[PDB]
C-alpha cells in the first residue's frame, strides 16, 4: 500500500512554463485527495472531489505549469484565449480537476523572471493536451524568415517576466491539472 | 507592400446590418491578430473586435451579439458583419493587425459608418447680418441649417474672400438633421460698399444656394 | 479590465520645446503590452513605440517613451510643428482618452457678437440665435445663454474650430434654438461669455425688434 507522490509536483520546487508544461503519470499507489486552505483554486469537472477518496482509476495525470492570475480561468473545458489555444487546452469532455494557487512569494523575482514563458504566435489552436516546445520562427507575413526574426518574423514564445509588485491578476500562479484515465487494465491508483 | 485596404461603410438605419471588409497586402490575416477599432466622431480610439490566428474572437461588451468578425484566406480579407446597428455605433472604423508586444502597427485608412433614420435633405440657408453698432470689426456669416448627410461646402463670393473665413464643423441636431455655420470678420468701412454672398454646396441632394448677407434694418 | 488615463489632457508648448505625455495604468501592467500612437486629423494611427520604449520602424528620435509599473510617459525632445498632433497609450485591449499637444501662443480674449434670427426663418417656425466668438486662446471659453435674463440649458449646441494655422487662435460658434412661439414671448436676448483674457464676462445681446 504505496502512496502517490503528490509531494513532488505540487510542492515542487521549479514549475515549468505553459507552453512546456509537466507531465507525471501516476500509477500503482493510493491516493488522499481530501488532504488536498492556501489552494485557493479547486474546480472539479465530471467528478465531485470528496468521493474521489472512494474511487479507483487505471492512471492519473499530473500537468503541472504557471501562468499569470486572469489566465488560470481558461484551465477549463470549453475556454478560448492565448493559454487555451497556444499553450494547454482542456478537452471538453474533461473528467478531472484544475488545482491553482498563487505563488508570488515563489516565482516572481525583483527585476524581473523571465525563465517562464507562454507561446504567443500559432497559426492554429491546440488540441486537448498538445503540447508544443517548437521555437522556430513565426511567419506573419507572405514571405519566409529561415530563423530570422524580423518584420512579419517573430519569436513565437514570450516572457511573463513576473514581478511582486504586479497585480494579482498579472502575479504568478501555479496550476496541476489531475486527469484520471479509466483505460481497460486493472486499476492501480485507488483511494483509502 | 504591407497595408490594409478597407471599404463597405455607408448610410444605414437603426436595426440595419452592414458589413465592413479590409483587404490585406504583405501580412497573412489568417496568421495574425486582427482587430476592429473604431473612433467616433470628436471622440477617442475604442477597440471593437479582435480575432486570433487560431480563429478565437473576442469582442468589446457595446458590441457583443450585434457584431461578427470574420476572415478570408482565398482573399486574404478580414470582415466585421455588424447587425442591429444603433445611433451609437456611428464611427470611423479602422483594422489593424495587432502584434501584442510589438503594438498595432499596421492600420487600415478606415471607413465612416452613419446610422439614422433620416432622408437625405437639402439645407436652409439663412444670413447671419451684422451688428447695426458694430463696435471697427463686423462679423457676418451663412447658417446651414437642417440637411442630411454631411457634407456641405461654404465659400465665399465664389472664393474670392478666403482671410478671415470660419466655417464650423456641423453639430447633429435632435431632429437627426446637421446644422452648419461660417462667418466671416470684415472692416465696418466695407460693408457699405463691398456686397458678400456665401455659397453653399449640398451634392447628396445637387442643392447649390448663393445667399447675400447684408445688413439688416 | 485595466483603465489608462492620459495628462495632460492638452498639452501647450512651442516648436522646439520639449513634450511629456503621461499614461497611468489602474493597475501594475507588464510593460512589454504598452503602445503609444499618433494620429492627425483625417489620418489614421500611426504606431510610435512598442514595447513601452521601443521605437517602430520610421520613428525620429526625438520620440522615446520610458516608465513602468502604472506610469509610462512619450516624451518628445525635439518638437517640430508636424508633431503637434493627438496621442493615445493603448495596453491590449485598452486605450487611453489622448493627449492633444497645441501650439502655444499669448492669451488673446475672443472677439463677441450676436446674431439674432432671420426673417425667412422665422417664417418656418423655428427661431435661431447665433453667438460668435472670434479667435480667442487658449480653447476654454463658456458660453452662457440668457432669454430676459433666465439663463437657458439643454436648448443650445457649440462648435469649435480647429487652432487657425496663422494666428493659432480658436473660434467657438453656439446655436441656441427655439420655436417661434417661444422666440416671440420673450425681447432681451443675450449671450454672456466667460474667458481667460477677460477682466469680466462680456455680454453681447439684442432686443427683438430693434
Ligand atoms: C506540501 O508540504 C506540506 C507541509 O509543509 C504538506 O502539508 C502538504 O501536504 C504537501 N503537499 C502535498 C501535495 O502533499
Not at chain 3, 91 to 119: L, M, N
Request: charged share 15%; proline share 6%.
Amino acid at each position: 500500500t504505496n502512496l502517490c507522490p503528490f509531494d513532488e509536483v505540487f510542492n515542487a520546487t521549479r514549475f515549468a512554463s505553459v507552453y512546456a508544461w509537466n507531465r507525471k503519470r501516476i500509477s500503482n499507489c493510493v491516493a488522499d485527495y481530501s488532504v488536498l486552505a492556501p489552494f485557493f483554486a479547486f474546480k472539479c469537472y465530471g467528478v465531485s472531489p470528496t468521493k474521489l477518496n472512494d474511487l479507483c482509476f487505471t492512471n492519473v495525470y499530473a500537468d503541472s505549469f504557471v501562468i499569470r492570475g486572469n489566465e488560470v480561468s481558461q484551465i477549463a473545458p470549453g475556454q478560448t484565449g492565448n493559454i487555451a489555444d497556444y499553450n494547454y487546452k482542456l478537452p471538453d469532455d474533461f473528467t478531472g480537476c484544475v488545482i491553482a494557487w498563487n505563488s508570488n512569494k515563489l516565482d516572481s523575482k525583483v527585476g524581473g523572471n523571465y525563465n517562464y514563458r507562454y507561446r504567443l504566435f500559432r497559426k492554429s489552436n491546440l488540441k486537448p493536451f498538445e503540447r508544443d516546445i517548437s521555437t522556430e520562427i513565426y511567419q506573419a507575413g507572405n514571405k519566409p524568415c529561415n530563423g530570422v526574426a524580423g518584420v512579419n518574423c517573430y519569436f513565437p514564445l514570450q516572457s511573463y517576466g513576473f514581478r511582486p509588485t504586479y497585480g494579482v491578476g498579472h502575479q504568478p500562479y501555479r496550476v496541476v491539472v489531475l486527469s484520471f484515465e479509466l483505460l481497460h487494465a486493472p486499476a492501480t491508483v485507488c483511494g483509502p | 507592400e504591407v497595408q490594409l485596404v478597407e471599404s463597405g461603410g455607408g448610410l444605414i438605419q437603426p436595426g440595419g446590418s452592414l458589413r465592413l471588409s479590409c483587404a490585406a497586402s504583405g501580412i497573412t490575416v489568417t496568421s495574425n491578430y486582427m482587430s476592429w477599432v473604431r473612433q467616433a466622431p470628436g471622440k477617442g480610439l475604442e477597440w471593437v473586435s479582435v480575432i486570433y490566428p487560431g480563429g478565437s474572437t473576442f469582442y468589446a461588451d457595446s458590441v457583443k451579439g450585434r457584431f461578427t468578425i470574420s476572415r478570408d484566406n482565398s482573399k486574404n480579407t478580414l470582415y466585421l458583419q455588424m447587425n442591429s446597428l444603433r445611433a451609437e455605433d456611428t464611427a470611423v472604423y479602422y483594422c489593424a493587425r495587432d502584434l501584442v508586444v510589438y503594438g498595432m502597427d499596421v492600420w487600415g485608412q478606415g471607413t465612416t459608418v452613419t446610422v439614422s433614420s433620416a432622408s437625405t435633405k437639402g439645407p436652409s440657408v439663412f444670413p447671419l447680418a451684422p451688428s447695426s453698432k458694430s463696435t471697427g470689426t463686423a462679423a457676418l456669416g451663412c447658417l446651414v441649417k437642417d440637411y442630411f448627410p454631411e457634407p456641405v461646402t461654404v465659400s465665399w463670393n465664389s472664393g474670392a474672400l478666403t482671410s478671415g473665413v470660419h466655417t464650423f464643423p456641423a453639430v447633429l441636431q435632435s431632429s437627426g438633421l446637421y446644422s452648419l455655420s461660417s462667418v466671416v470678420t470684415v472692416p465696418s468701412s466695407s460693408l457699405g460698399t463691398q456686397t458678400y454672398i456665401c455659397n453653399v454646396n449640398h451634392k447628396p441632394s445637387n442643392t447649390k444656394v448663393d445667399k447675400r448677407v447684408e445688413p439688416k434694418s | 479590465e485595466i483603465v489608462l488615463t492620459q495628462s495632460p489632457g492638452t498639452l501647450s508648448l512651442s516648436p522646439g520645446e520639449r513634450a511629456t505625455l503621461s499614461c497611468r495604468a489602474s493597475q501594475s501592467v507588464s510593460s512589454s503590452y504598452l503602445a503609444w500612437y499618433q494620429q492627425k486629423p483625417g489620418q489614421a494611427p500611426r504606431l510610435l513605440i512598442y514595447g513601452a520604449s521601443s521605437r517602430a520602424t520610421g520613428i525620429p528620435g526625438r520620440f522615446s517613451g520610458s516608465g513602468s509599473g502604472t506610469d509610462f510617459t512619450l516624451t518628445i525632445s525635439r518638437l517640430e510643428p508636424e508633431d503637434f498632433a493627438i496621442y493615445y497609450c493603448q495596453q491590449g485591449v485598452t486605450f487611453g482618452g489622448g493627449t492633444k499637444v497645441e501650439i502655444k501662443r499669448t492669451v488673446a480674449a475672443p472677439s463677441v457678437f450676436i446674431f439674432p434670427p432671420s426673417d425667412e426663418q422665422l417664417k418656418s417656425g423655428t427661431a435661431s440665435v447665433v453667438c460668435l466668438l472670434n479667435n480667442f486662446y487658449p480653447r476654454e471659453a463658456k458660453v452662457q445663454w440668457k432669454v430676459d435674463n433666465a439663463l437657458q440649458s439643454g436648448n443650445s449646441q457649440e462648435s469649435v474650430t480647429e487652432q487657425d494655422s496663422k494666428d493659432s487662435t480658436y473660434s467657438l460658434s453656439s446655436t441656441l434654438t427655439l420655436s417661434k412661439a417661444d422666440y416671440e414671448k420673450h425681447k432681451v436676448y443675450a449671450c454672456e461669455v466667460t474667458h481667460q483674457g477677460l477682466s469680466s464676462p462680456v455680454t453681447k445681446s439684442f432686443n427683438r425688434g430693434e
